[PDB]
Amino acid sequence: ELLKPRTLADLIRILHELFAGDEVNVEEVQAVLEAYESNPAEWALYAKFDQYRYTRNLVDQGNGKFNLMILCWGEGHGSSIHDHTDSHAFLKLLQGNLKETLFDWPDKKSNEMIKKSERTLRENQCAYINDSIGLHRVENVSHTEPAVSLHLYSPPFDTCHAFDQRTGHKNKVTMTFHSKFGIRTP
Ligand SMILES: [Fe+3]
């Protein structure tokens, strides 16, 4: 039974219920994420920005089955074109807007990766991707407004691939946490 999360802490409690088992009801998880109305005071502790690139701030380690983190995107900060390592990936905007560009998996032949579509993700919206849907790039294209997003990955993963848009070639990268549970982790 899916109720509206009243606070971020309430959302986290609900997520622990939704991931108590071995499978994932994507539509339910996305609906509850969308229904939490971002309250900046509740997540300020995790919103630790870096001047030069976006940061990943761990909020909850889940039950072994999922990670929940907040990503903080300065003006003009963006990601690589990335996969998600055979995991579910949910992305909910907490502040600002992000552009999501979708790409197909490359062919073996070296070729430019042409976007299949793009969309603007707006405050409180929750998007979803997995490797069967494709690859994506996420960007804060704003010149004036930082963005903050809430990400849930299941299972957790700390490596993925970045893809060279000019060739489709991939390289494994390890993802690091800028902070964990509100504590900066250099
Ligand atoms: Fe992603």
To the question of whether residue 143 is assigned a binding role by annotation, the answer is no
Take residue 171 and report the two structure tokens written for it. 């390289």
Q: What is the resolution of this structure in A?
A: 1.4
Neighbour count for residue 38 (Cβ, 10 Å): 16
Q: Which residue has the tokens 């963006």?
A: 78
Q: How far is the CA of 66 from the centre of ligand 1 (A)?
A: 15
Structural domains present in the chain:
1-186 (2.60.120.10)
Q: Is 178 annotated as a binding residue?
A: no
The CA-atom distances, in angstroms, between 132 and each of 52, 86, 89, 106, 152 are 31, 9, 12, 13, 17
CA 175 and chain centroid, separation: 12
Residue 134: exposed, middle, or buried by beta-carbon count in 10 A (0-12, 13-18, 19+)? middle
Flag whether 84 is marked binding: yes
Contact by Cβ (8 Å): 18, 25: yes
Contacts of 15 (CB under 8 A, 6+ apart): 29, 32, 60, 62, 66, 68, 152
Ligand 1 centroid to Cα of residue 82, in Å, is 6
Distance in Å, CA 57 to ligand 1 centroid: 15
Other beta carbons within 10 angstroms of residue 43's beta carbon come to 19
Interval between CA 137 and ligand 1 midpoint (Å): 7
**What is the C-alpha separation between 113 and 46, in angstroms, rounded?**
34
